Amino acid sequence: SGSMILHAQAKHGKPGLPWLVFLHGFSGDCHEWQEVGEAFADYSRLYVDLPGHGGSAAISVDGFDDVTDLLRKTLVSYNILDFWLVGYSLGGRVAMMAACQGLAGLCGVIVEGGHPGLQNAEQRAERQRSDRQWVQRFLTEPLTAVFADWYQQPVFASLNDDQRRELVALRSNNNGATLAAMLEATSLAVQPDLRANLSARTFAFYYLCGERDSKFRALAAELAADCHVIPRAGHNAHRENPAGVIASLAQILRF
DSSP 9-55: EEE---TTSPEEEEE--TT--TTTTHHHHTT-TTSEEEEEPPTTSGG
Residue ranges covered by each domain of the chain: 1-255
CB 240 within 8 A of CB 232: yes
Q: Is 214 helix (H, G, I), strand (E, B) or coil?
A: helix
CATH of domain 1-255: 3.40.50.1820
Between strands 8-11 and 44-48, the pairing is antiparallel
For 165-171, the CB contacts below 8 A with 24+ separation are 168/144, 169/144, 171/27, 171/28, 171/143, 171/147
The number of C-alpha atoms within 13 Å of 54 and in the hemisphere containing its C-beta is: 19
Distance CA 188, CA 191 (A): 5
* H or E stretch at 71: helix 64-77
Structure solved via: X-ray
Alpha-carbon span 151 to 229, nearest angstrom? 24
Does residue 153 contact residue 137 with C-beta atoms inside 8 Å? no
| Residues 67, 23 contacting (CB under 8 angstroms) | no
Alpha carbons within 13 angstroms on the beta-carbon side of residue 252 total 25
Per-residue exposure over 186-210, b if at least 16 CB sit within 10 Å of its own CB, e if not: bbbbbbeebeebbeeeeeebbbbbb
Distance CA 44, CA 243 (A): 19
* Integer Cα distance of 57 and 54 in angstroms: 6
Tally of CB atoms within 10 A around 232: 11
Q: How far apart are the first and last CA of the chain?
A: 43
Distance CA 204, CA 109 (A): 6
3-class DSSP state of 239: helix
DSSP H helices in 114-236: 121-140, 143-150, 161-171, 176-185, 195-199, 214-222
Cα of 66 vs its chain's centroid, Å? 16
Q: How many residues does the chain have?
A: 255
Report the DSSP beta bridge partners of residue 10. 46
How many CB atoms lie under 10 A from the CB of residue 38? 12
Query: 107 near 204, Cβ under 8 Å?
Result: yes
